[PDB]
């Protein structure tokens, strides 16, 4: 029976340490340390470490901070990884607590005897060059300090989360953010048969906070029906359209759309929210949709 | 006719509106913002603002949204003039980054002023880009909330649907084969000689369902991005073959197999695991 500690550092350190209790890993001690008490406060873990308590003073790390409270809290560290033959070090590198913080538990704990494996991410390539920068300098300082270093890199994670290459892993959302604006400026400024004046648009936008917004594709016979639907309950809505006061609905086909097909869509719509709900609608042409209709509805009011 | 614009701030908002111009939407005007002038310079759009050009130098703002507000309340007055005389603002931007989260609340603000209807639509980030992100899009969305008449809020989670962790997994893909039973099990000692003073190493995940399931997930492990192309330059891996009750000890060997078969000597060492039903090979990589 060998004794097996996972110490994570900072927030991504943290965050794993609490996925690990969740899902019930069997036969490992955990350990949390942080420089922010707050985030140390409300974790799941028996073993809490608040990192440099003297000068940080609990409050954060920022983005030298790391590093500094990890050696001021040598004693608490030493004294929670006593005994272990392995160690797991996680981190997340570019912050201000793990980058700095993690060489030093790691020095500490090889040490002490331990087998010391450093698991940690680097950072998305959004997060920009200063943070990627100061990644790669972590990583270097916890190499010198550990027997063996898994490096996850959160761009590689991306893509095997979202299943597609690193340059389309926002495809979808920024066409999301595209059709958002398109279902109401469509209806506005592309003439179609059934345009909204900019004055109701007001109506149902102005003075509101939060608008919902559901969109769902339908395709055959029943494309209405199956459109709408999706539409109503589409995984992007934040919370339900039901009793919402007012709404916009863009119905948008190719050139075999009917205007019986236009009309059930609403009529769904306007079912699902009820009650009396002031609901404005109108279409679009698309002429690359075969027997396929796209409905969108935009609500406020709660 | 109603005068529309479409101003998106940050780098989710550059790609968005380069999306919007692709796509060909017509009646709007795009305008783009952002603290990166490197963003700036590769968009579509014909009307650009490097916020903050006099402090951030179009250098970029890095994690922090304070840097972002500064910059939009440092380029107000551009930012008026890129916006008089609309009717409708819409306000792109994705929450969590330093320039989206801060600069989008101020230009809202500014554009509501000049009279315009302002429309804001942002996206949230992933639960795995961590905590400070997360945190820092939470107050943005407020703070935007604060200033624009309608706020549409897409969530990149729930975006992922239309078991998360991935330190969880290095770390349970070996601690499992020693700290519990299984159809194969390693000694601490196996993995001790694998990765004492072995430096560098990567992870590959790979999942396969049904009939031949170890041929796919094992063959999916190998070529994982997370692997980064490069498993046939290690010397050591250990594999964790991990399934439900149904798991013989005739997947684990058709399962290695096919990994040894690309494999030279690539010393490898195995066991399993089980979970809720089907077969998920982890590979960590060494030497
Ligand atoms: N739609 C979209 N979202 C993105 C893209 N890149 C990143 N994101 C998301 O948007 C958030 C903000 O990123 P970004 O706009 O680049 O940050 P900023 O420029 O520093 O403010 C990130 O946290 C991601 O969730 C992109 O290309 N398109
Ligand atoms: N995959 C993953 N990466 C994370 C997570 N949290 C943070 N990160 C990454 O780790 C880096 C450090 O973030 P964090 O640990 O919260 O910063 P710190 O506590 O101030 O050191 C971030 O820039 C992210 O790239 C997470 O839950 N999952």
Do not use: C, W
């Not at 005994?83 to 700095?100: L, N």
């Not at 989360?161 to 959302?173: H, M, Q, R, T």
């Not at 506005?188 to 149902?204: C, R």
């Amino acid at each position: 029976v060998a004794s097996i500690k996972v110490i994570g550092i900072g927030g991504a350190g943290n965050n794993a340490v609490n996925r690990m209790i969740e899902a019930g890993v069997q036969g490992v001690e955990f350990i949390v340390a942080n420089t922010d008490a707050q985030i140390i406060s409300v974790s799941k873990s028996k073993n809490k470490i608040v990192l440099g308590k003297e000068t940080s003073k609990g409050l954060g790390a920022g983005a030298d901070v790391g590093r500094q409270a990890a050696i001021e809290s040598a004693e608490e560290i030493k004294d929670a990884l006593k005994g272990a033959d392995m160690v797991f070090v996680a981190a997340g590198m570019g912050g201000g607590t793990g980058t700095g913080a993690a060489p030093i538990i790691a020095k500490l704990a090889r040490e002490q005897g331990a087998l010391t494996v450093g698991i940690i991410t680097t950072p998305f390539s959004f997060e920009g060059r200063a943070r990627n920068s100061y990644a790669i300098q972590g990583t270097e300082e916890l190499r010198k300090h550990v027997d063996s270093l898994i490096i996850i890199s959160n761009d590689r994670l991306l893509e095997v989360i979202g299943g597609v290459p690193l340059k389309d892993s926002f495809k979808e959302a920024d066409n999301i953010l595209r059709q958002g604006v398109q279902t109401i400026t469509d209806l506005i400024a592309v003439p179609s048969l059934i345009n909204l004046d900019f004055a109701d648009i007001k109506t149902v936008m102005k003075n509101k906070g939060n608008a919902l917004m559901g969109i769902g594709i339908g395709s055959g016979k029943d494309k209405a029906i199956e459109a709408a639907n999706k539409a109503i309950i589409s995984p992007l809505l934040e919370a339900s359209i039901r009793g919402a006061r007012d709404a916009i609905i863009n119905v948008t086909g190719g050139n075999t759309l009917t205007l019986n097909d236009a009309n059930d869509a609403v009529d769904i719509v306007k079912q699902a929210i009820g009650g009396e709900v002031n609901i404005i609608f109108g279409t679009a042409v698309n002429e690359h949709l075969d027997d396929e209709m796209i409905v969108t509805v935009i609500a406020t009011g709660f």
